[PDB]
Structure formats: structure tokens, C-alpha cells
Amino acid sequence: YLRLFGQDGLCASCDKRIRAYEMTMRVKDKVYHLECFKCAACQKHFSVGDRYLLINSDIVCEQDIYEWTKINGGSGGSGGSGGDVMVVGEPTLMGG
């Protein structure tokens, strides 16, 4: 009867389509799944209000972010500006 959908449509980590069961936070454009939203280093749960780093492959937290960057190649000097960073937004609801 009624179908409320306003998300992207498909994942960017898996191959599962997006439905009223994502429970993810507002990312750049591609909205992942609750299980698809994991760190690439510690694989821990994210927090709403903190910062995070989005990689071309997966996402990274703000705990090992400084390590992962130097591991890959994104150092901006000791105490210097290396790159941008986004703050974890609020999660989406299935109707509200």
C-alpha cells in the first residue's frame, strides 16, 4: 500500500539494496548498511558526534585514523594539517 523510500538505492560495500533497514548515518552520498559501516583498522562500532574518515574502500574511525593515514600515506607533518575530516551525522529512521 504505502512505500516510503528516500535513500540512495544500493550499497557501496556489499551488493544488497537499501531498504527501510539501513540504520546508518548521513555519509557523503553513498549510504551504507548498519553492518557495512565498520572501521578498516579496528573494525569497531562508530559513534554519533565524533569524527571519521571515509576511504575509497571502507571507512575508518577517529581512534586509529592518525595511524591508518600514516600507514597508507597521508601524513601532513607532526602537528600539521594533513587532510579533511568529517563528523559522524545522525542515523536515519524508517519513518520519522
Add this chain to the structure above:
Amino acid sequence: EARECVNCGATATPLWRRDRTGHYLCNACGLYHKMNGQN
């Protein structure tokens, strides 16, 4: 892990209580600022 409580440090907390100043509190120590009235 994520941020830690300013009183305990429950990283496994279901939700983080963050105010305007940025006083990260789990929930247990978080209600201390509300009920007791302390910071």
C-alpha cells in the same frame, strides 16, 4: 574504540551523551550531571 566517558569509559555504551560543551558521558555517569546537578 570510540570516545570515552569522562567518568568511567564505557566504549561499549549503546549511545554517547554529548552536550554543547562536549562532555562525553556514557549514560550512568551522564545522569549524574542531570539529577545531582553536578558537572
